């Protein structure tokens, strides 16, 4: 005695893929053409709806890695190219009678270069980095020549990280999971939905997730399959660790023109003293946040075992070390006096180098020149996450790292995007007529 | 197990009007529909009205159809019964009663369930 | 507020149908996907249309349950199921009720048609 | 099948015109031409909404048979000719029968509008 | 002619609603531009959908006139007032006026779902 | 041919300073000046 | 044998065979490639 009613309206879903809008409240990520975002976003909570999670297969972090690459290469296309610079380099030691752990790091440079007219050559004297130029007075080349085309950053437009927003289409809603100890995938309890995400930062960083979220009760521990060594385990925190990171060096930046309407930026001078660029991580507060780490891996490895932390075994330098940028000049720091340490049941200075030729998101064949700061460099960041990768009785974890798409994981672990079906049946005692 | 209660007055004049109203209890009254029911004091009883729970939707016998009219409050949780024009043929005991019909999503009825014990109305 | 009835049940979320009606429709790839987010509307708007619903939102039909699709009691279904439970259950005879209310409704109006055809 | 009757007569023809009305919807080129479609599409549904036909396939009218237009017999338009046949004669005439066919449903809207005010 | 009736007033400006709905519809920014326009089209049609107006350029509904929204007389409103004017004085009250049309049409079509219940 | 509707009793307030349609023009133009000299000789050389 | 206008010798006409023939073509030498790189990320290939 039942007859079917057609609804229009049903507040039903389905998982799905689609492209998502960039969002904000010169920048590298900011552009004109990306929508403001609403002054006070609305925020439903679903009561009695338990959605499955899966961050692991989120679409929503290939949407994020892809834009940020096309947002870095249109910010880099409108600059300088450096492909007059592939010259050989006459060097020899900056500070060639310094006792310092910098002794031999900057080598200063000779070239002929060119000049606003194609018949007459500028000699130019420049410093760099060790880790920028490869001998081949000795000759020496950059390391890039022998791989790709260099293109300089715009010197106008700030590395800075800005919030970006993701908004779904029209037609689709973002569900956001809000239950605590989340491990980032199934079924998550206290479902809201939103239209756009929190900002979230674009922050570049390798082994340590620098300035994001934090967990709200526990530190958690994520990974695909935990017991799976081809995997990385990401790790977020609860409290965060301040990092202090510094470039002590007052440098004195110098330019040239190239050509017409081009301008080449070096690193002309060093005033004071040359001083090793390095970070500051307070050891009582890094000590406990192991701690609390190796409570939770033991929570998934046993409550017997031994964990024990060690230095990045190798690769290139990218995943070696800590690689950041703070200050417009991109860090790589040794984090070897952080991962070493065995678990059975003063500030620490991290050296780093600085590298003016960064090879980002494991691209071969676009290399970027980073323009040299004026003055002396000092950032503050939050350590909120770490990245770790692991290798019997005793179990050892190592920074890991290096695959971009898992820093955006670390945020959107929370969100999942979905299609509206607003169509449905269901039998009901109407007759038509 | 339900409670449901007239209230109402005795005798009126013929030309004027009167209004009943039941409480109920004991049940949600904004899950069911609500309809009257009048017997005359010599003879059976019979159908007066129908109101749908939302309250939307009124129903009512032809003998009755323009004069009655029905009303329900569903936060008070009370039904109404507007009567102008009593005649001596209108003159009986009106029950309230639940049940009579179904908003579409609900099993059918077409009985009435509970009942209530009845206001008397002379003329 | 915008699939709050979500977790809530049928009866009492097919009183908010209004909430998720209005916000189906309110770079090269945003384009696309306003492009496509408009095609998925008309589609869904073109099929009631199909079915005689296209001014309706609860729109009532000639087509009879075969009981073979959910052999649940009406109470049962609007009372204590959510839709997404309910749509979980149909998936699987959706296109079956579909060609149905399509030939329902293609038979309905050869009927008034023929109706109107009496002078 | 879509199209299938193309070479049928008008009468059997006319029984399949939901398989059309569901095909008809479902680089910067491809964007262009999905756009395109979607406007041709919207078109149609428009002027079907100015005559009063916003819900059906088959929509009767007030407007009267000239047979100015067409003077064939009703039997041998629906039973002997097919669809392109008869847009081939029809097509000299069809603005002017759709600009009458937006002029009544105009004077129906107004009367209907006037009995609406009789209390 | 196209809003050749703007400066009309509202009684005989009335008159003429085909043409201005007729007109309504017919590189990456162009394109954006004509998406725009489409969905534009799509919210003020479904916006009439949801009031049961999807078929009608005049649609009657069960929304009262609260007179404080604007207390003119009807003929001073049909025979003095421009249609400029008229959305000039209501814009204050319109989204109002929406919520009210949008209510009540769900509460008829819940209405004619229990009468079409009733066997 | 274009067709022109004349406006009886319409008096539309106009202002030339606040008008959107002189940044297109000028956006428009500037963009089709770009995109007919993109593919010409460029003359780098000629810094000699 | 189709042609836009069979008697107008400036169009061309196409013959669509119902049979093929096969052709056999070859480059018999056995050529080595060699190859140099002409600039940062850029390398240019030659016969050897
Ligand atoms: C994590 O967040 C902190 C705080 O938002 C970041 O530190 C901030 O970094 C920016 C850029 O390096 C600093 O802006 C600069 O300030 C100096 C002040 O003299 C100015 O001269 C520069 O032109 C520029 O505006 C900002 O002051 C600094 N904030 C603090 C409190 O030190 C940090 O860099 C973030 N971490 C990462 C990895 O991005
Ligand atoms: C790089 O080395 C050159 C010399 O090899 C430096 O130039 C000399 O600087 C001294 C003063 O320190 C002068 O007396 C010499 O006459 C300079 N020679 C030439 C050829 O310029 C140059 O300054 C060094 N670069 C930096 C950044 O200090
Ligand atoms: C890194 O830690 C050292 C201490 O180990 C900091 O040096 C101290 O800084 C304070 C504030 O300027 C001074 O009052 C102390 O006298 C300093 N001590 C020494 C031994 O120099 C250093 O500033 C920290 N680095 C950063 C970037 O904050
Ligand atoms: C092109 O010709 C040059 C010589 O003109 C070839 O190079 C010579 O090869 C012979 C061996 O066949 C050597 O003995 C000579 O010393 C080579 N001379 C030089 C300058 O290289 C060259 O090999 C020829 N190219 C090819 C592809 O055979
Ligand atoms: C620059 O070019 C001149 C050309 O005569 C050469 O003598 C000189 O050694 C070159 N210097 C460097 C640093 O390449
Ligand atoms: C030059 O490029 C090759 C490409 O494979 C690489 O293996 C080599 O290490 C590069 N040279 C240096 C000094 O890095
Ligand atoms: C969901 O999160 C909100 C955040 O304010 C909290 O108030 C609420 O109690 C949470 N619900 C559950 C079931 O955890
Ligand atoms: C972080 O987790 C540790 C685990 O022992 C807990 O003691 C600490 O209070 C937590 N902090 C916050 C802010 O939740
Ligand atoms: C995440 O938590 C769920 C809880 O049900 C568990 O089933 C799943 O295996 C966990 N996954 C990992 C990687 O810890
Ligand atoms: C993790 O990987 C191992 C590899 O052997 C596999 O056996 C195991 O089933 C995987 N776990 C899951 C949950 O897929
Ligand atoms: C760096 O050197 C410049 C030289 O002009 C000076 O003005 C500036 O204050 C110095 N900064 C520091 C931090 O020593
Ligand atoms: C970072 O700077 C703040 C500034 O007050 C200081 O208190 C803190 O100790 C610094 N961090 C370290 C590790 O020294
Ligand atoms: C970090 O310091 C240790 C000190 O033993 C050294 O062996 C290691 O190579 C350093 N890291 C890098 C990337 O060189
Ligand atoms: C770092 O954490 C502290 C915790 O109180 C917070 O006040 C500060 O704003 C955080 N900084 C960043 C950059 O997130
Ligand atoms: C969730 O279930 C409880 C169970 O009593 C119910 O009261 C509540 O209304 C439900 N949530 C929604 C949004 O209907
Ligand atoms: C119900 O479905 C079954 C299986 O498709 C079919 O055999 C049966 O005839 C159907 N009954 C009705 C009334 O449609
Ligand atoms: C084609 O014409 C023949 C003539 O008898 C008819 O039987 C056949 O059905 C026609 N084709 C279609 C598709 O109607
Ligand atoms: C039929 O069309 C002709 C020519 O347009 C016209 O003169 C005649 O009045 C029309 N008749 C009707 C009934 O419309
Ligand atoms: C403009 O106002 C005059 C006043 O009499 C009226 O006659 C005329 O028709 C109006 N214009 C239009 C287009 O209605
Ligand atoms: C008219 O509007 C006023 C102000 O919003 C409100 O107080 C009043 O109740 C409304 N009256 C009606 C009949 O809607
Ligand atoms: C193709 O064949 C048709 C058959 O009717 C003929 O009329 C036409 O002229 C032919 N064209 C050519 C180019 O052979
Ligand atoms: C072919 O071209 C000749 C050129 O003189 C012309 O006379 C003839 O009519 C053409 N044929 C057709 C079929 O157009
Ligand atoms: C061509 O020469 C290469 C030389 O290594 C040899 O390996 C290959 O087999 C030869 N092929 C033929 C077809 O002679």
């Known amino acids: 005695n039942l007859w079917v009613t057609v609804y229009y309206g049903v507040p039903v879903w389905k998982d799905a893929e689609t492209t998502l809008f960039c969002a904000s409240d010169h920048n590298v990520w900011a552009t004109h053409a990306c929508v403001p975002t609403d002054p006070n976003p609305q925020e439903i909570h679903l009561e009695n709806v338990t959605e499955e999670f899966n961050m692991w297969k989120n679409n929503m972090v290939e949407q994020m890695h892809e834009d940020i690459i096309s947002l870095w290469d249109q910010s880099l296309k409108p600059c300088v190219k450096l492909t007059p610079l592939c010259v050989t380099l006459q060097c020899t030691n900056y500070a060639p009678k310094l006792r310092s752990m910098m002794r031999g790091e900057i080598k200063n440079c000779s070239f002929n270069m060119t000049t606003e007219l194609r018949d007459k050559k500028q000699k130019v004297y420049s410093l760099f980095y060790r880790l920028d130029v490869v001998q081949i007075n000795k000759e020496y080349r950059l390391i890039n020549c022998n791989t790709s085309a260099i293109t300089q950053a715009c010197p106008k437009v700030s590395f800075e990280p800005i919030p970006i927003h993701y908004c779904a289409p029209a037609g689709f809603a973002i569900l956001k999971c809000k239950d605590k100890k989340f491990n980032g995938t199934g079924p998550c309890q206290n479902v809201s939905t939103v239209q756009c995400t929190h900002g979230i930062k674009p922050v570049v960083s390798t082994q340590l997730l620098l300035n994001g979220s934090l967990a709200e009760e526990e530190v958690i521990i994520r990974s695909e399959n935990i017991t799976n060594n081809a995997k990385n385990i990401l790790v977020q925190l609860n409290t965060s660790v301040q990092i202090n990171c510094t470039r002590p060096s007052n440098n004195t930046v110098k330019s040239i023109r190239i050509g017409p309407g081009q301008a080449f930026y070096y690193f002309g001078d060093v005033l004071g003293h040359v001083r090793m660029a390095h970070c500051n991580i307070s050891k009582a507060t890094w000590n406990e946040t192991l701690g609390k780490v190796v409570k939770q891996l033991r929570k998934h490895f046993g409550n017997n075992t031994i964990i024990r932390f060690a230095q990045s075994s190798g690769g290139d330098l990218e995943v070696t070390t800590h690689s950041f940028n703070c200050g417009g000049e991109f860090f790589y720091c040794n984090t070897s006096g952080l991962f070493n340490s065995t678990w059975i049941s003063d500030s620490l200075i991290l050296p780093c180098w600085i590298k003016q030729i960064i090879n980002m998101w494991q691209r071969i064949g676009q290399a970027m020149y980073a323009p040299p700061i004026q003055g002396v460099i000092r950032c503050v960041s939050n350590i909120t996450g770490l990245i770790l990768t692991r290798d019997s009785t005793t179990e050892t974890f190592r920074p890991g790292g290096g695959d971009m798409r898992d820093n955006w994981r670390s945020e959107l672990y929370k969100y999942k995007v979905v299609k509206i079906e607003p169509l449905g049946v269901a039998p009901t005692r109407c007759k038509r007529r | 197990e339900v409670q449901l209660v007239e209230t109402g007055g005795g005798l009126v004049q013929p030309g004027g009007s009167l209004k009943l109203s039941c409480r109920a209890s004991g049940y949600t009254f904004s899950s069911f529909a609500m309809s009257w029911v009048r017997q005359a004091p010599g003879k059976g009883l019979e159908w007066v009205s129908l109101?749908?729970?939302?309250?939307?939707?009124?129903f009512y016998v032809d003998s009755v159809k323009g004069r009655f009219t029905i009303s329900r409050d569903n936060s008070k949780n009370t039904l109404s019964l507007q009567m102008h024009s009593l005649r001596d043929g209108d003159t009986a005991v009106y029950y309230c009663?639940?049940?009579?019909?179904?908003?579409?999503?609900?099993?059918?009825?077409?009985?009435?369930?509970?009942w209530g014990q009845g206001a008397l109305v002379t003329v | 507020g915008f699939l709050g009835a979500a977790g809530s049940t049928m009866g009492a979320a097919s009183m908010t149908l209004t909430v998720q009606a209005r916000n189906l429709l309110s770079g090269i790839k945003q384009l696309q996907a306003r492009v496509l987010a408009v095609e998925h509307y008309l589609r869904d708007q073109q099929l009631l249309g199909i079915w005689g619903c296209s001014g309706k939102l609860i729109c009532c039909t000639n087509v009879p349950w075969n009981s073979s699709w959910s052999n649940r009691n009406l109470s049962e279904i609007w009372d204590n199921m959510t839709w997404l439970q309910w749509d979980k259950e149909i998936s699987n005879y959706t296109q079956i009720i579909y060609g149905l209310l399509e030939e329902s409704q293609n038979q309905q109006e050869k009927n008034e048609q023929d109706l109107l055809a009496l002078d | 099948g879509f199209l299938g009757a193309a070479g049928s007569t008008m009468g059997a023809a006319s029984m399949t015109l939901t398989v059309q009305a569901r095909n008809l919807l479902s680089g910067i080129k491809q964007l262009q031409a999905r756009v395109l479609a979607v406007e041709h599409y919207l078109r149609d549904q428009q002027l079907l909404g100015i005559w009063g036909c916003s819900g059906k396939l088959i929509c009767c009218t007030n407007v009267p048979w000239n047979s100015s237009w067409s003077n064939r017999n009703l039997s041998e338009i629906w039973d002997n000719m097919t669809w392109l046949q008869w847009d081939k004669e029809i097509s000299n005439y069809t603005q002017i029968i759709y600009g009458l066919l937006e002029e009544s449903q105009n004077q129906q809207e107004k009367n209907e509008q006037d009995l609406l005010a009789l209390d | 002619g196209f809003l050749g009736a703007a400066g009309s007033t509202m009684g005989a400006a009335s008159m003429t609603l085909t043409v201005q709905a007729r007109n309504l519809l017919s590189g990456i920014k162009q394109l954006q531009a004509r998406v725009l326009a489409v969905e534009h089209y799509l919210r003020d049609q479904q916006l009439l959908g949801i009031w049961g107006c999807s078929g009608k350029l005049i649609c009657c509904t069960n929304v009262p006139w609260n007179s404080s929204w604007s207390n003119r007389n009807l003929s001073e409103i049909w025979d003095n007032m421009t249609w400029l004017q008229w959305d000039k004085e209501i814009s204050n009250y319109t989204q109002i006026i929406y919520g009210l049309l949008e209510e009540s049409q769900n509460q008829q079509e819940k209405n004619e779902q229990d009468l079409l219940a009733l066997d | 041919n274009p067709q022109e509707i004349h406006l009886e009793n319409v008096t539309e307030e106009f202002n030339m300073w606040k008008n959107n349609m002189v940044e297109q023009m000028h956006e428009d133009i500037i963009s089709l000046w770009d995109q007919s000299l993109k593919p010409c000789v460029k003359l780098t050389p000629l810094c000699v | 044998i189709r042609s836009e206008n069979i008697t107008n010798n400036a169009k061309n006409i196409l013959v669509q065979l119902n049979t093929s023939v096969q052709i056999n073509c070859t480059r018999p030498s056995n050529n080595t490639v060699k190859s140099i790189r002409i600039g940062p990320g850029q390398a240019f290939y030659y016969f050897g």
């Open positions: 009663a639940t049940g009579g019909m179904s908003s579409a999503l609900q099993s059918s009825k077409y009985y009435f369930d509970f």
């Open positions: 109101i749908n729970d939302r309250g939307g939707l009124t």
